[PDB]
Design a protein around this ligand. Structure first.
Ligand SMILES: NNS(=O)(=O)c1ccccc1
Length: 165
């Protein structure tokens, strides 16, 4: 009944940077929220720990969650390779929104993006399921290692991850 919280400890070429925590809107998108929560604890035997943020575009978003091919072409959900667009109740209102990457309708896997700007053109195409609670300043620090074409200038990794009380 309380929306769960998850944390990522970020590292930059293997050096600790800081912690970002997220509220997951299990009250609005329980299935999408649950996928991200379980990938964050690793309780299914796979998930986000050790994975990288492969695409970071300043003024736009930080993209991660491809834990099988590390480049935007892989990942899987806890339900099978892909699952459906749960609903589009939540909109891309500004920095800190956590939303699902996909390749067309009903193609959610494990990849996600953290918005660093309002991205309303994504409304109704990408499922918004969470938001940064603590450490937006760490997200901004990550963001500086991106570039216009999304290539990062240092390796940005989820050193550790899990669920908070
Ligand atoms: N390239 N399409 S995507 O699902 O990865 C995506 C869309 C919008 C923002 C970040 C990521």
């Amino acid at each position: 009944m309380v929306n769960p919280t998850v944390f990522f400890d970020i590292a930059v070429d293997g050096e600790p940077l800081g912690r970002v925590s997220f509220e997951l809107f299990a009250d609005k998108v329980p299935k999408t929220a649950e996928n991200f929560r379980a990938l964050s604890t690793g309780e299914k035997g796979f998930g986000y720990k050790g994975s990288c943020f492969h695409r970071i575009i300043p003024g736009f978003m930080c993209q991660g969650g491809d834990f099988t091919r590390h480049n935007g072409t892989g990942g899987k959900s806890i339900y099978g390779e892909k699952f459906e667009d749960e609903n589009f109740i939540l909109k891309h209102t500004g920095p800190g929104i956590l939303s699902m990457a996909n390749a067309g309708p009903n193609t959610n896997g494990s990849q996600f993006f953290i918005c660093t700007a309002k991205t309303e053109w994504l409304d109704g195409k990408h499922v918004v399921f969470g938001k940064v609670k603590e450490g937006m300043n760490i997200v901004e620090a990550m963001e500086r290692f991106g570039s216009r074409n999304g290539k990062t200038s240092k390796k940005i990794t989820i050193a550790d991850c899990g669920q908070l009380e």
